[PDB]
């Protein structure tokens, strides 16, 4: 048994990094527009390909399409990958976000990345990356913690834009504060820290902007996690 | 801005260790008892105390005791200290904790510390420690993961003995596997290592018992630096 040991993070690849950008809504749902999450969603993007990932974005799907193309990365082999990154950019309320015309509970989507029906994965970090409050040229739009901060099983890391009590904040050309934030300490410090003390450092940074957000990080990992180069 | 900076522990005091230990409970309301606790609290009271604090142990409090004791705590000054620790081992459902006679609120009992009621502690870690889950020679019982792993506010450190769709194991002689485990690693590092770094070593350590189903840990950190118990002495 050994105090230091680091999950294996020399596969071929680094792996996959999913976004799920939403930007707009069916009318009847009557949400408001997340103007300025392109800022995110591209910040992120450039963020994690410096780290090796291979992004993929997605912007307004409805639930099906969403569904069907979580499922399909979800059976593709990650053998040769080291870990897997996953990010919403949304609404949400209780433990569901929203794709472009209705919710999905967060633990169906999560799920499919269990040791249960994604053998590739196991003994692998899973990151899962969650913006997502309740609403409602460069303006500061305020939603509300909605979302429960809740975890998802072994090796897992769910890091949540805003807790319970709290608000998320949101520029309409920048983006949000904590992705804002996140992808700063990613540019600086994604290549040398180990992951969570970078999260803790976007935990100080954010709650330090001046109704206080207070971002957080459920963590169910069982090693030390760091994106050296290659 | 600082990458390494960490929390200042370096007060006259390390602080207070607060420790809920609920073994039975009022008849009326059905609920099996934690043989095995006593092991549990007698266990993190050693270990803490070699970490320095002032450790306070209560067994079996009602809900009108529990409160008074922990608003009691809320109050007296903690300027001089590093932080606080919170313990609970108990039943839980949702984000219900039980007392001996009635369930409470996990969050009246922590909002208690939020900076607005308690600025002594303001800028200081807060640790809560959440042993709860469903319950149902030495016998080896397993409960059903109910208690909502979900933090608090800044600077707030949430451990759970374990995680939704998972389930605790208590055993009769030697007590909870999380608290088993989280002991011994605060023996052999709690000195050394910072606390979150601790707190994944027992993730590991946890996950991997068997005996046919798992238990997995998990802490939520809204912690802003790093934190330590290097020795004072």
Not at 119 to 123: I, Q
């Given at each position: 048994f050994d105090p230091a040991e680091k999950y294996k993070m020399d596969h071929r690849r680094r792996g996959i990094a999913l976004i799920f950008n939403h930007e707009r809504f069916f009318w009847h749902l009557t949400l408001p527009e997340r103007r300025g999450t392109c800022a995110d969603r591209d910040n992120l993007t450039r963020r994690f390909s410096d780290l090796g990932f291979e992004v993929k974005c997605f912007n307004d799907l409805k639930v099906e399409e969403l569904l069907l193309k979580i499922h399909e990365v979800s059976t593709v082999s990650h053998a040769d990958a080291d870990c897997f990154v996953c990010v919403f950019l949304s609404h949400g309320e209780g433990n569901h976000i929203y794709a472009y015309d209705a919710k999905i509970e967060i633990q169906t989507l999560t799920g499919l990345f269990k040791g249960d029906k994604c053998?590739?994965?196991?003994?692998k970090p899973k990151i899962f990356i969650i913006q997502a409050a309740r609403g409602n040229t460069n303006i500061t739009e305020v939603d509300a913690a909605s979302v429960y901060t809740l975890p998802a099983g072994a090796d897992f890391l769910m890091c949540y834009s805003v807790a319970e009590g709290y608000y998320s904040h949101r520029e309409t050309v920048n983006g949000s504060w904590y992705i804002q934030d996140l992808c700063e300490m990613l540019g600086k410090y994604g290549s040398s820290l180990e992951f969570t003390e970078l999260l803790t450092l976007v935990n100080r940074k954010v709650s330090q902007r001046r109704k206080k957000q207070v971002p957080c990080f459920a963590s169910m990992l069982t090693k030390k996690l760091h994106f050296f180069p290659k």
């Open positions: 053998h590739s994965l196991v003994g």
